[PDB]
Amino acid sequence: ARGVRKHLKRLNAPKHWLLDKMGGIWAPRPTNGPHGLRECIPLILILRNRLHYANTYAETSMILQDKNVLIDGKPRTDPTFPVGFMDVFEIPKVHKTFRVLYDVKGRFTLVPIQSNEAGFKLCRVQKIFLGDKGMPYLSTHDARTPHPDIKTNDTIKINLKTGKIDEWYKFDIGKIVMVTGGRNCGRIGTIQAIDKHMGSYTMIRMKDTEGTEFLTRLCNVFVIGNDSPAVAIPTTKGIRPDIIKNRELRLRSIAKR
Amino acid sequence: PRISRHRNSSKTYSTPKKPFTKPRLDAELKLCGEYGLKCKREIYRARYMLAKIRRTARNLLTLDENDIKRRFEGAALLRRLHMLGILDEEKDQLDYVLGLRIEDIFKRRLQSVIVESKLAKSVHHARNMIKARHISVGGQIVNIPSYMVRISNTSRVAIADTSSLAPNGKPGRTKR
Amino acid sequence: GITHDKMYKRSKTGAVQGKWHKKRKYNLGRQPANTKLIVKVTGQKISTIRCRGGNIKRRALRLSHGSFAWGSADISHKARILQVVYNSTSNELVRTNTLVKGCVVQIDSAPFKSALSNDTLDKEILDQIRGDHILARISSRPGQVGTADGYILEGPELLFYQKKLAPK
Amino acid sequence: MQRSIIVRRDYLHFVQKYKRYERRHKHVAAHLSPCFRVKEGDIVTIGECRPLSKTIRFNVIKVEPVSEAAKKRFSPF
Amino acid sequence: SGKTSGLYTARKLRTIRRIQRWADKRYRKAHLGTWLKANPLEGACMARGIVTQKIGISAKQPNSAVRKAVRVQLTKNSKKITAFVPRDGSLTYIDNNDEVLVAGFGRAGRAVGDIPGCRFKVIKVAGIGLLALFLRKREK
Amino acid sequence: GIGNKFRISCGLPVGAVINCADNSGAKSLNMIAVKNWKGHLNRFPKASVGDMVLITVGRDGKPELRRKVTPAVVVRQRKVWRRKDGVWIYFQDNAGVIINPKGELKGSSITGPVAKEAADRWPKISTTAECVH
RNA sequence: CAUCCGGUCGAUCCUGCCGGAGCGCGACGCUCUCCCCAAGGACGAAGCCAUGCAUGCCCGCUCACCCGGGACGCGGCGGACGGCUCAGGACAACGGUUGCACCCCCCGCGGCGGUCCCUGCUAGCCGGACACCGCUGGCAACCCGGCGCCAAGACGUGCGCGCACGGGCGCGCGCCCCGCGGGCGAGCAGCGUGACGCAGCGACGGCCCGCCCGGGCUUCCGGGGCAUCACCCGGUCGGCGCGGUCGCGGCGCGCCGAGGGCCCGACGCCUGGCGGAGAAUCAGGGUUCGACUCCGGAGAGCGGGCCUGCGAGACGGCCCGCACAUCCAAGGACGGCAGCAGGCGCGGAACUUGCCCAAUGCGCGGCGCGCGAGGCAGCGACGGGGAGCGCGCGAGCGAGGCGGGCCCACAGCCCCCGCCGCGCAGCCGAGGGCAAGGUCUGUGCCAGCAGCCGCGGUAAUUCCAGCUCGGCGAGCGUCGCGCGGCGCUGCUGCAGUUGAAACGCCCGUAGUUGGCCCCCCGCCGCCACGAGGAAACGGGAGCGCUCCAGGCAGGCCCGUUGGCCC
């Protein structure tokens, strides 16, 4: 069909961005880069709509036209540059630091973190490639590209300062793990089991802290600390609040309103 | 293209399958006379919503008591009716919802709540007064006679702060 | 307008297929560049053709010479390249002297004559090395890669092939 | 065909307007190695392959014979 | 009759319905496509036309009257329609070969009432609806 | 026609069916007669290149043109003719182009080579013809 | 979300269909007091088009200019995205599900980064070679000529480390098989070893790698009618050797065989055939429709054929064949509104040659413009929703008008203010079905009415009028169609003695259906439970748009929400 599309309609946009159906024919489109289109959120919305800092979409481009915002410790200014999972985003004018995390419903959330938390970044290890003239290399969930005793699915704690391997979270049963994709995004649990089937789509079984054994695909699994979260968890601890527990919260919110 | 197409609309008024039934027709004239309704379309909107709410209770009936969906929907459906003041506050059961009649929807009318407050002492005068916006629901002047006041706002509904009774300025014949 | 699109082919049931589209650029095909053996060299013009994604391919159309390897002794050297002997698909292509992988060719023995001094290095290549021409087949796609390297025929392919062309 | 067999794939299709299943048959072309000796009425375990020919995208990975001809019986294996 | 009811008889049930669904005259008229090709008003609510002649039709007995009608040639299919001009004395409003819009009598291609052979009836003449002319809401 | 013509050997007599150069949708034109022909007794009317001929479109031709005597112009002839410059010229096939009584051509395009004599006589033929030989 | 009534007779009970009764969505007639919301030349013409507009943005060089204000050309990026419309296309498209160990992919993001030379070097870093612009000129126009001169982060050349290096090579694991990796479910990689090529990029380091965003294909299942279509196909079906392509493949070619399909409907034909997300109607099951919003396809009068590019077999590129045109000085030139307005043809049927990029995006580069994308207004009874035409004894507006406030790219409209204050209805009927005159006029089987049964033949409950009354309501009538009705299509759930209908009879192949019986597993089917795969949409939580149809808002806040299901 001719060439690559460079537009994303509002109805086409993923549900997680939560862009209002009316008021806009089309949502912004991410750029090819560290994260994927449905695996990332736009930087313009994070400031313009989520934080409400920019009154118009254009006046979000103005804010980063002059350097003022950083992703993963790098200026990374482009307005629609993809900002995805475990990203160290910091507004130095606001003097605030936010990991981009997944909410229990599944939408992305900016959660404030300590400078020590800003010091390290979490990214999953994709399959090791053997290219670049035989030098072993492995890619991340953020596409960044080694230590020999490492496998795929494990999470490396890249510093973003050293830009090198630090604490490697090996993929084994019982590590406290996050779910990146599927219906139960944001939920945190130790991996009870794995059934490979020696074909494809290895099954994933996850015992949560409360004893509910949630499940997902093995690709969509993120390690979050070999032992302990080793990150600033948003205050939900992936407890999976139920629809009625969500109605309680909403009704008390209205009471406070 | 044109998000005007994306905006939606719904049929809130249902005509009778049998159009001419003399007993039903006369009863509708009684309702129209007693509750000061403008046309039988007015009644149809109320009849439609009585039906759907009762149907929702019947859908909940085929669910087990305390089913996650049954409890969530059951709480909400009961809550809205007593929140508007339509259903008995204490009962809060599906069986009590099944007995609701359009008279309850008619009682929720702002123009209805005025004849009980003795402000216009006539549904037809209440309708007239609401048109001139001489009745205000708690700091909100209302030109529409079907405000559907929620139970708490019955205390709030009163003559408007704008010139009328205890006048801000000169109202009506005093003005003219 | 050459295409490899399957739309123009009939189905397994021998049924005509409705043409839902005009020929598309991605399914395009290009003229077979028939690499031609120069024969006596007393010219190697190799074309370069733009591909999909701005890639490049080298099209040999006339060439002589090219790298060859004696697998049995594992010695590899450039060779002059003599006439094509056998095409396995056509008897006309051999006489035309078009070059395509799988076409068996004669080669000069002068670069590889250095092994005549050595002894017991097989017997078949020993007699070809003594002779002016060595039996060898092409191992490179002359048209797509733009080079026509080959392996000197050794053992069974040489046995069957010699019987196929040389005796009368 | 030489170095090729036709695999009949029996299968059921459910109709919802009438809650009954209609029997269907799909023939599939499979390239067979000489290591497989194949007779009609036998049951073969095919596998996916890059298209070998116009109608062949499947290769045989195992062949299971049956005594004589075991009738047919529409077996969705 | 067993109405073929087996777990594997689902092609037979489907086949029987598609073949025997054509027996119904109404389904046949609707989905054969014969009406669409043969309809003077082919998939149209109404059509423009010239009045071939103004000729009354004698009504079917018991009723006895000359119901004034106009033969009409359609612009779209050049087919001749017999259209009954309605109400009282409305034929006078029409002149021979005037523009006329004609709509079906309301029986979906069937004749309505005593008029013999009247699949359609006149709605508008030279841009003016015949009732509008009849009530004098809009004059000729 | 423009100017004074020069006598050239008249290849086509009456009855000569000639192929149609124009795309008007006629394939073969049957020559009924020659415009401007006072003839002697027994002499079939004869026409050369650049001569207007009343023709009738044949059965193969589109029906609208068929059944009407129509004017045409001979544009090519098999018979060799001598130009006053001593060039003896001939064409592979005899051909005609259907033209109104005024000079305008019924067909938008003229197919194949066209003779100079026709091109000089008819300005429209000269502009339409790709090659004048 | 489970409902009927009127019509065969002297009456009766049936079958049987006719007609009503409700809804949707288009025409059509008559009328509409506002406010809000809103479809809009798809409907056998993907017919044809006048006019204006729909893709530019920057300087990389600036010698003109003239203070970096900076044109003009070259240079880079984009013009393939976006808008439009369903013509084609019936194992196709399209959808879920797969595979690329058979692959291509600019920007961007995260990394690697030895580039042989004989040499020839200027590598303190080089050439020649042109636009622009002068200077003379053609042409009716279009469009360009020659001269002379000068530029570029343009282009051409060019040192540069033998784990130099793009490519393509020849050779490098194995012992019945099955279990460690840089690996994988799997001999895949990446190299060592011996040659060849001298690819890039290098005159401001990118060679290259991955991720990714799309493609290119591919697996499996779904995927219209017709038997007054029963036999089909012949690169068709396999294998083999080449080419060709980004790549697999009869994808093209030779060669070699004899296949591949089919009553489980092939092939052939037809289609006023885009497909799904969805829509309409509705107890349940069904039925019906998929122009248009979202997605995927396919096309830009019709066929072909192409270069540029990272990507187009591009038509707001080019080239040609075929139509049908326009300019014209007659020599020549130059097309494409299935973009947006607007014209015309046609049809029953469908809007302004309207205004702006400020949002909503996108293009171009850190410093702002381009966009008939989109927004905004105009028309606008497609339709949806909210109020009016009274009420009071004399109470009182909003519909309006006029200035504000405010809104808005600016207007406006709404709303809020002060003043001034003009309430303002129709369209079908009354014999029944089916609601509402055992009133007076005319007329006299005429005129007419009447979906249906019926009325009218000089005392019409049926017409033409008056009068009354009814039903709906700023809407009401009329026609076409879908659905329900209609269990009158019957899976649920129809009938065949006599209302329509058991083949005259029998064998019979496919097809379909097959007594019981073994508990204990293996494959079936089957059933439950997961996992993963866009929303809008339907439902639904929460929420006072003054009420509502709405919208995902809102509020002194779950980490405020926008769950959750489909």
Extents of the domains making up chain B: 19-166
Nucleotide nearest residue B147, measured CA to C1': G547
Q: Cα C8 vs. chain centroid, distance in angstroms? A: 30
Total structural domains in chain C?
1
Q: In Å, how far are C90, C97, C112, E102 from C136, measured between CA atoms?
A: 18, 15, 12, 89
Q: Which nucleotides of G are covered by protein (CB under 7 A)?
A: 1, 3, 17-24, 26-31, 37-40, 43-44, 79-84, 88-93, 98-102, 104-113, 163, 166-171, 182-185, 189-197, 199, 208-223, 225-226, 232-255, 257, 259-264, 266-269, 272-273, 281, 285-288, 292-300, 304-306, 308-314, 322-324, 330-332, 346-348, 358-363, 366-367, 373-376, 383-392, 394-398, 416-419, 421, 423, 425, 427-428, 434-436, 445-457, 463-464, 470-474, 478-483, 488-492, 494-496, 502, 511-514, 523-526, 530-538, 540-544, 546-565
Q: In angstroms, how far is CA A129 from the centroid of its own chain?
A: 23
In the block, residue with structure tokens 């630091």: A97
Task: Report yes or no on C95 lying in a domain.
Answer: yes
Answer whether F66's CB lies under 8 Å from F118's CB: no
Which residues 90-119 of chain E have a CB under 7 Å from nucleic chain G? 90-91, 101, 103-110, 112-115
H or E stretch at E37? helix E34-38
**Region label for C144, one of left (φ > 0), alpha (ψ between -120 and 50) or beta (otherwise):** alpha
Number of H helices, E strands in chain E: 4, 6
A243 touching chain B per CB within 8 A: yes
Q: End-to-end alpha-carbon separation of chain A, Å?
A: 52
Query: Does A245 fall in a domain?
Result: no
Q: How many domains does chain A have?
A: 3
Q: How far is A237 from D43, CA to CA, in rounded Å?
A: 53
Nearest in space to D32 (alpha carbons), one of D62, D75, D67, D55: D62
Question: Rounded to a whole number, what is the distance in angstroms from the first to the last CA of chain E?
Answer: 66
For residue D8, the 8-state DSSP code is E
Structure tokens at A39: 């695996």
Give resolution, Å, one decimal.
Answer: 3.2
Co-location of A180 and A88 in the same domain: no
Other beta carbons less than 10 A from residue A237's beta carbon: 15
- Strand G close to A26 by CB, under 7 A: yes
Angle between helices B123-131 and B110-117 (to 10 degrees): 120
Residue pair E84/E118 in contact by the 8 Å Cβ criterion? yes
Q: Are strands A82-83 and D43-48 parallel, antiparallel or unpaired?
A: unpaired
Residue C16 lies in a domain: no
CA distance D66 to D57: 25
Q: Is the dihedral of CA A133, A136, A137, A138 positive or negative?
A: positive
F98 in Cβ contact with F20 (< 8 Å): yes
Alpha helices in chain F (DSSP H): 116-121, 123-128
**Residue A190 main-chain phi, psi, to 5 deg:** -80, 145
> Which residues touch D19 (CB under 8 Å, ≥6 apart)?
none
| C156 φ/ψ angles, rounded to the nearest 5 degrees | -60, -40
Spatial contact of F58 and F65, defined as CB atoms under 8 Å apart? no
CA distance, residue E121 to nearest chain D CA (Å): 42
Asked whether at least 3 C-beta pairs link B and A within 8 Å, the reply is yes
Report how far residue B84's alpha carbon sits from residue B77's, in angstroms, rounded to the nearest whole number.
11
The nucleotide minimizing the C1' distance to residue C6's CA is G251
Q: Report the alpha-carbon angle C35-C38-C43, nearest 5.
A: 95
- Dihedral of alpha carbons C90, C96, C98, C104, sign: positive
- In terms of residue numbers, what domain contains A214? 171-240
Task: Say if residues F12 and F50 touch (Cβ distance below 8 Å).
Answer: no
Nearest to C64 by CA among C78, C74, C54, C51: C78
Answer yes or no: do A132 and A162 share one domain: yes
Task: List the F126 CA – G136 C1' distance (angstroms).
Answer: 36
Query: What is the distance between the alpha carbons of residues F106 and F72, in angstroms, rounded to a whole number?
Result: 9
Q: How far apart are CA A181 and CA E125, in angstroms?
A: 68
Neighbouring CB atoms inside 10 A of F20's CB total 27
Give me the DSSP letters along C39-104: SS----EEEEEE-GGG-EEEEEEEE--EEEEETTTTEEEEE----B---SS-SHHHHHTEE-TT-E
What lies within 8 Å, CB to CB, of E38 at 6+ separation is none
**Amino acid at residue number A199:** G
Residue whose pair of structure tokens reads 């408007």 in the numeric block: B160
Between strands F70-76 and F81-82, the pairing is: unpaired
- The DSSP H or E segment spanning F13 is strand F12-13
How far is the C-alpha of A224 from the C-alpha of A156, rounded, in Å?
A: 10
Assess if residue C92 is contained within a domain.
yes
Q: Chain C residues with CB inside 8 Å of D55's CB?
A: 12
Helix B22-34 to helix B40-61 angle (10° resolution) is 100
Residue A34 within any structural domain of the chain: yes
- Torsions phi, psi for A93 (to 5 deg): -70, -40
F22 touches F109 (CB < 8 A): yes
The spacing between the Cα labelled CA in C147 and the C1' in G168, in angstroms, equals 7
Q: Are residues A112 and A5 in the same domain?
A: yes
Question: Which residue has 């794995």 as its token pair?
Answer: A194
Would you put residue D41 in left (φ > 0), alpha (ψ -120 to 50) or beta?
Answer: left
- What distance in Å separates the CA atoms of residue A57 and residue A80, rounded to the nearest whole number? 10
Q: Tokens 């020696």, residue?
A: A198
Long-range Cβ contacts of B133-138 (<8 Å, 24+ apart):
B133/B160, B133/B162, B134/B159, B134/B160, B134/B162, B134/B164, B134/B165, B134/B171, B135/B110, B135/B159, B135/B160, B136/B160, B136/B161, B136/B162, B137/B110
Q: Which of A100, A116, A132 is the last residue of a domain?
A: A116
CA geometry: angle at F90 spanning F85 and F95, to 5°?
Answer: 125
d(CA F102, CA F79): 27
* Beta strand pairing call for F95-98 and F17-20: parallel
Show the tokens assigned to A98. Answer: 């936010």
The H or E element spanning position A63 is helix A58-65
* Residues linked to residue A181 through DSSP beta bridges, in sequence order: none
Report the relative pairing of strands A203-208 and A213-217 from DSSP bridges. Answer: antiparallel
Spatial separation of the C-alpha atoms in residues A65 and A81, rounded to whole Å: 13
* Euclidean distance between CA atoms B82 and B98, whole angstroms: 14
What does the alpha-carbon distance between residue F52 and residue F72 come to, in Å, rounded to a whole number?
A: 6
| Nucleic chain G contacts, protein chain B, residues 60-79, CB cut-off 7 A | 72-73, 76-77, 79
DSSP state of E83: E
Residue C93 CA to residue C84 CA, distance in Å, equals 9
Token pair of D45, please? Answer: 């375990």
Helix (H) / strand (E) element for C161: namely: helix C156-165
What is d(CA C134, CA C73) in angstroms, rounded to the nearest whole number? 15
**Tell me, in Å, how far CA of B24 is from C1' of G470?**
15
Longest distance between any two alpha carbons in chain A, whole Å: 64
What is the extent of the structural domain holding C71? 30-168
Distance CA A240, CA A216 (A): 14
Q: Please classify residue B88 by burial: count the beta carbons closer than 10 Å to its beta carbon, then call 0-12 exposed, 13-18 middle and 19+ buried.
A: middle
Q: Tokens representing E50?
A: 């010239």
Rounded CA gap, C83 and C95, in Å?
9
- Rounded CA-CA distance C19/C86 in Å is 41
Tell me, what amino acid is at A72? D
Whole-number Å distance between alpha carbons of C149 and B168: 105
Cis peptide before D51 (omega within 30 of 0): no
Residues A32 and A96 in one domain: yes
What separation in angstroms does the CA of A236 have from each of A58, A74, A183, A240, F16? 34, 29, 16, 8, 101
Backbone angles phi, psi at A256, to 5 degrees: -60, -30
Could you tell me if A98 and A116 are in contact, meaning their C-beta atoms sit under 8 angstroms apart? no
* Among E122, E121, E118, residue whose Cα is nearest residue E110: E118
| CA–CA gap between residue E49 and residue E51 (Å, rounded) | 7
Question: How do beta strands C66-70 and B140-141 pair?
Answer: unpaired
Strands (E), chain B: 135-137, 140-141, 157-159
Distance from C-alpha of A142 to C-alpha of A74, rounded to nearest angstrom: 13
CA F97 vs. chain centroid, Å, equals: 6
Method: cryo-EM
Determine whether E98 is exposed, middle or buried from the number of CB atoms within 10 Å of its CB (0-12, 13-18, 19+): middle
> Distance, in angstroms, between E13 CA and closest chain D CA?
8
Is A51 among the domain residues? yes
Buried b (16+ CB within 10 A) or exposed e, D30-46: bbbeeeeeeeeeeebeb
